[PDB]
Design a protein around this ligand. Structure first.
Ligand code: NA
Lengths: 318, 313, 315, 310
C-alpha cells in the first residue's frame, strides 16, 4: 500500500462491488446482484485494489484476503451511512415522507396497524414506516435514546422530557366463556368485577394496571397463571379458567373465536383507556407528528367500525 | 415420648398458609372447619409455637420460617407414595407448566381439554414466558416443567423430546412466492423477513435457517402483529404450523413451503430439573403434549392450506 | 383402597427395621412393642399394596421393592426431623436459613464483615448467599427463592418493601500516569474527558455511571466487562478510566498501576443501597434487624477503604 | 436503477455548507467552479430537494440542507475511515481486533497479554469483551467479535479452534480446613468438601461438576465472592492456577492439590469463524496468548504456593 495512489478516493460504486463480492463469494452472482457485467465488476474491483495498493479478493471460488476481511466492516459502514443519507432525504423535504419509526404498545398494535398502514400506503406513499411493538417502559427508553420517533401508548406517560398528543378514549369490554352467567349482559356495575376470576397479562403491560385500577374504584382486589398475550388469555377464557377485559379494537381479532361471549358495564360506568402519541419535546417535527395523530384517530374509528361489524354489542356511554 | 407432628397436621398448616381462609382451607382438604382448627391447634400446642394469627388468616414470623420445612416434608411424602404406586398412580394435583409464547396459544386448547376430560384431578397452572425466564423459573422451583425448543443448553436439566414442528412461509397474497411448495433455503435471501424480537427462540431459529442457506428496525413481540405487517406488504415471515388456523387465515395472506428435501422445523421438548424424582409423571405429561400437538396439526390440516412435506424417516 | 396416605409413624417403623436389621431392637428404638411395630409395618404394606420386608423369619430382609422405597422413606423422615428441630428456633430472630441476594458490585466487598457479624451475633442463622444482577434478584424474590435482596434503590418493583441502608460514594479510578491522578476537586464535567470502561448493561453500576454523565453532559463502546477486576486490568493497561463504589477500594484499587480521584464536595456521585423484600412477608422486624447488620458491615468496609490511605469523597 | 448520491457530490455539498461561498468551496476541493456547480445541481436534482440558497451576499443552507448535512458528513467520515484503514490493512496484527474472553480467564491473562501487545504489536488496537461462553459464541457468529478465548471443545459448528494450553486447577479452602496444604488428594476427596461454585452460566461450574462425576443454594457470579465465602468457612472451591495471585493470597485461605496421577485441568483455546481468511494472524495471536499464560503461571509460581505436579 505504498503503491497507493495518493489522490485516489474510492467511490460508493466500488465499495458496493467489493462488499457484494465478499458476501456472494462468486463474481457472476455478484455481478447479477448489481445488474452489471462480469467485466464491469472486475474493472471496479481492480480500480479499487489498484487505487488502494491492497489486494482485497484472491481470484475456483472467491475468497476475501486478510486485508479485505479487515476492511469489509469499514466499507459496510460507508454504504450504510450513504443509505441513511438517501432515506433521510426523502423525509427532509416534506411532511410524512421518509422513515418514521413508530413504537406501539402490544395491546394496541395489531388492532390499529391494518387501518393505519392502509391509510399511509394510499395517502402518504413516500412515508416508510417502521414499527416497534414493545411495552411502555421500553418504548419510553427508545424514545429518549432516539431509536424511535413517536410512541403510541396510554396516557399519562409520566415521562418528563415528552410531549403528548391525546388521540382517543378506547372502551374496554368484558370477555367470558360462552356459558358464563354475564354472557351478553349490557348493564354490569363495577362491582360485578368481584364475581370474575380475572386473567390478566403480567405486570409489564399497561392493560394489567388499568384493569387493576378499575377494580380499585370498585373496592375489589383484582387478585399463578401468567400470560404474555391476549390470544393466550382468550384460550384460557374459552377453557373456563377465567374472564378478562380487552380494548374494543381487539374484538374482531381476539373475541370472535368459538367459545367466547362478551358483556358491558352500564352507561354510567367509565371503563376505558386514554391512548396518545408521545414524542421528545425537543423534536422539531411537532407538525408532522400532529398529522400522524390524525391518521391514528382515523385508524381507530375504522377499527371501532370493524368491531361494530362483528355484531358484538359495544359499550354505550351517556 | 415427646410430640411429633403428623403429615395431616402439616397439610393443614400449609393449606391454611396458602388459602388465607379457614373455610377455603377446610374445603380444599375435604374436612370440616372444626377438624381443621383441631389439627392446627394440636400442631401449635405440640410445637409451643404460634404459626397462624387470628378477617383473613395471616402466617406469623415463625410460621413463615417453618412453612418451607413443612412443604419439604409433604413433598418427600408425596414422592414416596408416587414411587410406591409406580406407573398406575397417574397425574393428580398441581402442575405448573411453563410454555414458550409461540407454542402456548396453539397447544393449550387441546392440552387443556385432554387434561380436563382424562386427568380430572390434575390442576394445571400455565406460565407463558420466554425461554430464558422459563429456565430460571425451573432452576428456582417456581415451575415444574417447561415446554420449549431443544436443545435447552441448560446443564442441570433433563429433556424429553416431544415432536418436530414444521415451519411454513407466510407472505402477502400478491407476493411472487405465494403458494410455492418447492422453495430452497436460498429463497430466504429474496424475502424481507419480519421477525419477532431477539427474546423469542423463533427469531433465532429463523436466523439459523438463513445461515444454513448461506444468507433491522421493524420488530414485533407477537405473531399476530407480524401478520398485520405481512398483509400490509412490509415483509414475509415463517411461523410454526400449529399457528396456521389462528394467525394465517386472515384476508391478504398466502403461504408457501420449502421442498421435501429441506428441513425447516423446530424440535419441541419438555424440560425439567434432573434432580427431580418425578420423571415418570413428567413422561406421562409428555404423552399428553404429544397428543395435543397432533390435534393442533390436524386443525392446521383442516384449513386446506398445503403443509410442508418431509421425507418420512 | 385408593385413599391411603402413609403416616410418618409407619415410615419410622419401616426405616428403623431396615437400619437396625432386628425387629426387637427396632421396636425398642421407637419405644413401642413388637406387636405395635408389626401392626404399623403391615398397615404400610397393605396400604401401599407392596411387601417391604420378608415375613417368616426373625432375620430382617428388605424386599427389592423395600430397597427401592427406603431412600424416599428416609427423605421424608429427615424432612420431618428438620421441621421439628427448627421449630425450637422459629420464635428467635434471625435464626435458621436466610437466603440473601446481593448485587455483584456490592457482594464481595460487604460479605466479609457481614458474615463475621452474623457468625458472632446470630450464631443460629444459616446464611445462603446468591450473588446475581438486580433483575434476577427481583425475580428470585417474587418466586420466593430468596428472602431478601441487597441492591440499589429504587427497585421499581411492585409488591416489594425497601429498607434504605446507606449512600455509597463512587470514586474515579485511572491509570497511575493519568492527569486526574490524586485530584479531589473534580467537577461532573470531568467525565467528558474520560474514556469510561463500564461493566455491561446488565449491571446497575453501568446505568448509574451513564446517568451521572447525563446530568453533566448537556444534550448528548466495544470494550465491556462482566467484573470490576477485569475493568481494573484494562485501566492499568491505559485503555480507559472508570468509577467504582468506595467499598471496592481495598479489593480492586490497590493493585499496582492505578490512581484515584474524587469529585468536589458539592457534587453528588453515589448510589443508594437498600434491602428489598416481599411486602407480603410478616418478617419486617427480622429484616429490619438484618438491615442494621448490613449498615454496620458497610461502615467496616468503609473503614477498610480508609485503611488503605486512599482519600475518599467528602460531602 | 434510481439515483444514488456519489461521495463527490456529498463533498461538494458539505464544503459549500462550510465555506459559505462557491468559489472558496471549489478552491477547497481543487476543482473548478463549474465542476462544483454541476455536482451540486446533480445532487439536488437527483434528490428532488434544494439544499443551498443564494442567500444575501453569501450562501446559506436551506432547512432541508441543514437537516441532511450531519449525515452527508457521517458518510464522508465513514469513507475517510475506510481509506485510512486501508494503509494498515496488509500488516499482520495491525488495526482493530476484538477479543472475547471468558470471565474466569480474562482478569488473569489480560495484564500480560495487553503488555505484550503494547510493546511488540504497537499498531494492534485491542478491544476486549469479557462474557460467558454462550454469549461469546453468539457474538462470533454475528461478527461482533473476531476471536474468543474459552475452554475447549467449543462444540460450535462453523468454528475453528486453536488449542492454547492446559491450565491446572487448585483446591482452595479455609485456613483451618483439614485438607489445607495437602498435595496428594484423590478426586474422591471432592465428596468431603462443601463445594461453592460459580452459577451455571460459567464453564468453570460445569468443569468442577464433571470432576466430581469422575470421582464418583449459595451461588456466586465471581471468584472473588467465592473466596469471601471460603474465608468465612461456608465451603471450599477450585480455581484455575492463573487466578492464584489475584484471588488466593488473602489471609484466611489455604490451598491443596490432587496427586500427580490425577488430571484436573481445563483446555483453553482460541476460537474463530472457520470462514475467516485470517488464520495466519489468529495463529500469531494464539502465540501471544500462550506467552501471556506462561507469564500468569510464573506469577502463580512466584507466590511460593505449591502448584499441581503432573
Ligand atoms: Na445483635
Amino acid at each position: 500500500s505504498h503503491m497507493s495512489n495518493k489522490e485516489y478516493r474510492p467511490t460508493l460504486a466500488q465499495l458496493r462491488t467489493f462488499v457484494t463480492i465478499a458476501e456472494c463469494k462468486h463474481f457472476g452472482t455478484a455481478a447479477t446482484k448489481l445488474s452489471i457485467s462480469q467485466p464491469s465488476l472486475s474493472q471496479a474491483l481492480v480500480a479499487l485494489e489498484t487505487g488502494l495498493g491492497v489486494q482485497l479478493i484472491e481470484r475456483r471460488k472467491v475468497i476475501v484476503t486478510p486485508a479485505g476481511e479487515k476492511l469489509l466492516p469499514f466499507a459496510k459502514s460507508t454504504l450504510d451511512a450513504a443509505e441513511s443519507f438517501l432515506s433521510h432525504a426523502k423525509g427532509a423535504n416534506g411532511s410524512l415522507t421518509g422513515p418514521l419509526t413508530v413504537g406501539i404498545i402490544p395491546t394496541a398494535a395489531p388492532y390499529i396497524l391494518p387501518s393505519m398502514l392502509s391509510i399511509v400506503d394510499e395517502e402518504y406513499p413516500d412515508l416508510e414506516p417502521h414499527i416497534v411493538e414493545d411495552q411502555t417502559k421500553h418504548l419510553l427508553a427508545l424514545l429518549r435514546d432516539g431509536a424511535i420517533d413517536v410512541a403510541m401508548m396510554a396516557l399519562p406517560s409520566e415521562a418528563p422530557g415528552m410531549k403528548e398528543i391525546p388521540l382517543y378514549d378506547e372502551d374496554f369490554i368484558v370477555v367470558t366463556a360462552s356459558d358464563h352467567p354475564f354472557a351478553g349482559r349490557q348493564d354490569l356495575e363495577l362491582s360485578a368485577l368481584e364475581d370474575l376470576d380475572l386473567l390478566l397479562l403480567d405486570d409489564g403491560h399497561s392493560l394489567h394496571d388499568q384493569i387493576v385500577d378499575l377494580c380499585r374504584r370498585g373496592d375489589i382486589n383484582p387478585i399463578v397463571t401468567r400470560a404474555s398475550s391476549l390470544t393466550t388469555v382468550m384460550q384460557l377464557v374459552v377453557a373456563g379458567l377465567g374472564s378478562t377485559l380487552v380494548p374494543i379494537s381487539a374484538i374482531p381479532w381476539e373475541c370472535t373465536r368459538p367459545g367466547l361471549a362478551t358483556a358491558n358495564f352500564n352507561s354510567d360506568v367509565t371503563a376505558n383507556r386514554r391512548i396518545g402519541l408521545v414524542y421528545r419535546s425537543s423534536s422539531s417535527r411537532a407538525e408532522e407528528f400532529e398529522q400522524f395523530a390524525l391518521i391514528l384517530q382515523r385508524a381507530f374509528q375504522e377499527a371501532v367500525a370493524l368491531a361494530a361489524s362483528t355484531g358484538i354489542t359495544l359499550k354505550q356511554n351517556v
